[PDB]
Amino acid sequence: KEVLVLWAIHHPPTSTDQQSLYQNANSYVFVGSSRYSRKFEPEIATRPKVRG
Amino acid sequence: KTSSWPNHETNKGVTAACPHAGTNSFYKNLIWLVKKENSYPKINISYTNNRGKEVLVLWAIHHPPTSTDQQSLYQNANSYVFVGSSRYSRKFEPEIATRPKVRGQAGRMNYYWTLVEPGDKITFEATGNLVVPRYAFALKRNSGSGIIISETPVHDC
Protein backbone atom coordinates (compact mmCIF):
# COMPACT_ATOMS: atom_id res chain seq x y z
CA LYS A 1 0.00 0.00 0.00
CA GLU A 2 1.04 3.62 -0.43
CA VAL A 3 3.10 5.08 2.42
CA LEU A 4 2.99 8.65 3.75
CA VAL A 5 6.37 10.16 4.65
CA LEU A 6 7.01 13.48 6.43
CA TRP A 7 10.23 15.43 6.97
CA ALA A 8 11.40 18.95 7.79
CA ILE A 9 14.17 21.45 7.01
CA HIS A 10 15.69 23.80 9.59
CA HIS A 11 16.71 27.43 8.92
CA PRO A 12 18.91 28.81 11.72
CA PRO A 13 18.99 32.58 12.32
CA THR A 14 22.76 33.18 12.38
CA SER A 15 25.91 31.72 10.83
CA THR A 16 27.39 30.87 14.23
CA ASP A 17 24.23 28.90 15.06
CA GLN A 18 24.71 26.87 11.87
CA GLN A 19 28.38 26.28 12.67
CA SER A 20 27.43 25.26 16.23
CA LEU A 21 24.67 22.83 15.15
CA TYR A 22 25.94 21.28 11.90
CA GLN A 23 29.60 22.42 11.64
CA ASN A 24 29.18 22.98 7.88
CA ALA A 25 28.88 26.48 6.44
CA ASN A 26 27.33 25.34 3.13
CA SER A 27 24.71 22.60 3.35
CA TYR A 28 22.12 21.02 1.06
CA VAL A 29 19.41 18.37 1.31
CA PHE A 30 18.32 16.25 -1.65
CA VAL A 31 15.13 14.18 -1.44
CA GLY A 32 14.38 11.96 -4.41
CA SER A 33 12.00 9.28 -5.60
CA SER A 34 10.56 7.96 -8.86
CA ARG A 35 8.01 10.81 -8.91
CA TYR A 36 9.53 13.35 -6.47
CA SER A 37 12.82 15.23 -6.63
CA ARG A 38 13.95 18.38 -4.84
CA LYS A 39 17.04 20.09 -3.44
CA PHE A 40 16.79 22.38 -0.40
CA GLU A 41 19.27 25.01 0.80
CA PRO A 42 18.87 26.91 4.09
CA GLU A 43 18.13 30.63 4.38
CA ILE A 44 20.13 32.07 7.29
CA ALA A 45 18.57 35.32 8.49
CA THR A 46 17.14 36.82 11.68
CA ARG A 47 13.34 36.99 11.82
CA PRO A 48 10.87 38.34 14.40
CA LYS A 49 10.38 35.95 17.30
CA VAL A 50 7.19 33.87 17.36
CA ARG A 51 7.65 31.46 20.28
CA GLY A 52 11.06 32.79 21.28
CA LYS B 1 12.25 59.81 3.49
CA THR B 2 14.28 62.49 5.30
CA SER B 3 15.16 60.53 8.46
CA SER B 4 15.51 56.86 7.48
CA TRP B 5 18.36 56.57 4.93
CA PRO B 6 21.30 58.69 6.15
CA ASN B 7 23.81 56.80 3.97
CA HIS B 8 21.89 56.26 0.73
CA GLU B 9 20.83 58.43 -2.21
CA THR B 10 17.06 58.92 -1.90
CA ASN B 11 16.55 61.24 -4.92
CA LYS B 12 18.57 59.68 -7.74
CA GLY B 13 16.40 56.76 -8.87
CA VAL B 14 14.50 58.33 -11.77
CA THR B 15 14.05 56.38 -15.01
CA ALA B 16 12.94 57.13 -18.57
CA ALA B 17 10.29 54.38 -18.51
CA CYS B 18 8.18 56.58 -16.18
CA PRO B 19 8.41 60.07 -17.69
CA HIS B 20 6.64 63.11 -16.28
CA ALA B 21 6.35 66.37 -18.26
CA GLY B 22 9.21 65.31 -20.51
CA THR B 23 11.53 64.50 -17.59
CA ASN B 24 12.50 61.22 -15.95
CA SER B 25 10.47 60.29 -12.88
CA PHE B 26 9.39 57.30 -10.78
CA TYR B 27 6.58 56.08 -8.55
CA LYS B 28 5.53 58.15 -5.54
CA ASN B 29 4.92 55.41 -2.94
CA LEU B 30 8.32 53.72 -3.46
CA ILE B 31 11.92 54.93 -3.14
CA TRP B 32 14.71 53.52 -5.32
CA LEU B 33 17.93 53.64 -3.29
CA VAL B 34 21.32 53.68 -5.00
CA LYS B 35 24.90 53.83 -3.76
CA LYS B 36 26.22 56.97 -2.07
CA GLU B 37 29.89 57.99 -2.33
CA ASN B 38 30.95 54.59 -3.71
CA SER B 39 29.48 52.64 -0.79
CA TYR B 40 26.28 50.68 -0.12
CA PRO B 41 26.18 49.73 3.58
CA LYS B 42 23.75 47.12 4.83
CA ILE B 43 20.10 48.07 5.34
CA ASN B 44 18.35 46.72 8.46
CA ILE B 45 14.95 48.31 9.13
CA SER B 46 11.76 47.25 10.89
CA TYR B 47 8.21 48.40 11.59
CA THR B 48 5.61 47.30 14.16
CA ASN B 49 1.87 47.67 13.60
CA ASN B 50 0.45 49.78 16.44
CA ARG B 51 -2.59 50.88 14.39
CA GLY B 52 -5.40 48.47 15.28
CA LYS B 53 -5.94 47.49 11.63
CA GLU B 54 -4.14 45.36 9.07
CA VAL B 55 -1.63 47.26 6.93
CA LEU B 56 -0.85 46.67 3.25
CA VAL B 57 2.85 46.94 2.35
CA LEU B 58 4.36 46.93 -1.16
CA TRP B 59 7.97 46.66 -2.33
CA ALA B 60 9.99 45.74 -5.41
CA ILE B 61 13.22 44.03 -6.50
CA HIS B 62 15.38 45.26 -9.39
CA HIS B 63 17.18 42.97 -11.87
CA PRO B 64 19.81 44.87 -13.90
CA PRO B 65 20.83 43.58 -17.35
CA THR B 66 24.63 43.62 -16.96
CA SER B 67 27.24 43.15 -14.24
CA THR B 68 28.64 46.63 -14.90
CA ASP B 69 25.16 48.09 -14.32
CA GLN B 70 24.99 46.33 -10.95
CA GLN B 71 28.46 47.57 -10.00
CA SER B 72 27.49 51.09 -11.10
CA LEU B 73 24.20 51.16 -9.16
CA TYR B 74 24.88 49.16 -5.98
CA GLN B 75 28.68 48.60 -5.98
CA ASN B 76 28.18 45.03 -4.69
CA ALA B 77 28.61 42.05 -7.00
CA ASN B 78 26.65 39.63 -4.79
CA SER B 79 23.47 40.99 -3.21
CA TYR B 80 20.46 39.58 -1.36
CA VAL B 81 17.21 40.91 0.10
CA PHE B 82 15.50 39.27 3.08
CA VAL B 83 11.93 40.27 3.94
CA GLY B 84 10.44 38.69 7.04
CA SER B 85 7.43 38.84 9.36
CA SER B 86 5.64 36.51 11.77
CA ARG B 87 3.89 34.83 8.81
CA TYR B 88 5.89 35.95 5.74
CA SER B 89 9.53 35.09 5.05
CA ARG B 90 11.53 35.18 1.83
CA LYS B 91 15.01 35.77 0.41
CA PHE B 92 15.51 37.29 -3.05
CA GLU B 93 18.61 37.23 -5.25
CA PRO B 94 18.87 39.14 -8.55
CA GLU B 95 19.06 37.55 -11.99
CA ILE B 96 21.50 39.52 -14.16
CA ALA B 97 20.82 38.89 -17.86
CA THR B 98 19.97 40.86 -20.99
CA ARG B 99 16.33 40.63 -22.12
CA PRO B 100 14.40 42.08 -25.08
CA LYS B 101 13.54 45.74 -24.59
CA VAL B 102 9.95 46.58 -23.60
CA ARG B 103 10.00 50.33 -22.88
CA GLY B 104 13.67 50.81 -23.70
CA GLN B 105 14.79 48.82 -20.63
CA ALA B 106 16.65 45.50 -20.65
CA GLY B 107 16.29 45.02 -16.88
CA ARG B 108 13.23 44.04 -14.88
CA MET B 109 11.41 44.92 -11.66
CA ASN B 110 9.33 42.45 -9.64
CA TYR B 111 6.61 43.84 -7.36
CA TYR B 112 5.51 42.15 -4.13
CA TRP B 113 2.93 42.90 -1.45
CA THR B 114 1.97 41.66 2.01
CA LEU B 115 -0.60 42.20 4.76
CA VAL B 116 0.44 42.84 8.37
CA GLU B 117 -1.90 41.89 11.23
CA PRO B 118 -2.39 44.20 14.24
CA GLY B 119 0.40 43.89 16.79
CA ASP B 120 2.77 42.32 14.25
CA LYS B 121 6.21 43.29 12.97
CA ILE B 122 7.93 43.35 9.57
CA THR B 123 11.67 43.50 8.84
CA PHE B 124 13.67 44.40 5.74
CA GLU B 125 17.35 43.50 5.35
CA ALA B 126 19.31 44.20 2.20
CA THR B 127 22.67 44.87 0.58
CA GLY B 128 21.41 45.99 -2.84
CA ASN B 129 18.63 45.75 -5.42
CA LEU B 130 15.92 47.02 -3.03
CA VAL B 131 13.09 49.47 -3.76
CA VAL B 132 11.77 50.44 -0.33
CA PRO B 133 8.17 51.43 0.51
CA ARG B 134 7.28 54.96 1.56
CA TYR B 135 3.50 54.95 2.10
CA ALA B 136 1.26 52.23 3.56
CA PHE B 137 -2.50 51.82 3.84
CA ALA B 138 -4.54 50.73 6.87
CA LEU B 139 -7.55 48.90 5.46
CA LYS B 140 -11.18 48.90 6.57
CA ARG B 141 -13.45 46.15 5.26
CA ASN B 142 -17.03 46.13 3.98
CA SER B 143 -18.87 43.25 2.33
CA GLY B 144 -21.18 45.18 0.00
CA SER B 145 -18.59 46.57 -2.43
CA GLY B 146 -16.93 45.53 -5.67
CA ILE B 147 -15.04 46.52 -8.80
CA ILE B 148 -16.88 47.03 -12.09
CA ILE B 149 -15.70 47.85 -15.62
CA SER B 150 -17.80 50.35 -17.55
CA GLU B 151 -17.60 53.23 -20.02
CA THR B 152 -20.68 55.21 -18.97
CA PRO B 153 -20.02 58.61 -17.35
CA VAL B 154 -20.33 59.35 -13.64
CA HIS B 155 -23.00 61.82 -12.56
CA ASP B 156 -24.56 63.28 -9.39
CA CYS B 157 -27.41 60.81 -8.80
- Please check whether residue A41 touches B, CB under 8 A: no
Cβ A48–B89 below 8 Å, yes or no? no
What are the start-end ranges of the E strands in chain A? Answer: 29-32, 37-40
- Please check whether residue B7 touches A, CB under 8 A: no
Q: Which of A45, A46, A48 sits opposite B86 (nearest CB)?
A: A48
Method: cryo-EM
In 3-state terms, what secondary structure has residue B131? strand
Resolution in A: 2.6
Residues 6+ apart with CB under 8 A from A3: none
Chain B hits for A45, CB-CB cut-off 8 Å, are 82, 84, 91, 125
**Helix H or strand E encompassing B20:** strand B15-20
Closest Cα of chain A to B147: distance in Å? 36
Distances (CA, A) of A34 to A31, A37, B145: 11, 8, 49
Residue B61: is it exposed, middle or buried by C-beta count within 10 angstroms (0-12/13-18/19+)?
buried
- As a whole number of angstroms, the distance between CA B8 and CA B25 comes to 18
Cβ B84–A50 below 8 Å, yes or no? no
- As a whole number of angstroms, the distance between CA A18 and CA B82 comes to 18
Helices (H) and strands (E) in chain B, counts: 1, 11
- Please check whether residue A45 touches B, CB under 8 A: yes
Single out the residue of B134, B133, B29, B117 nearest to residue B81, CA to CA: B133
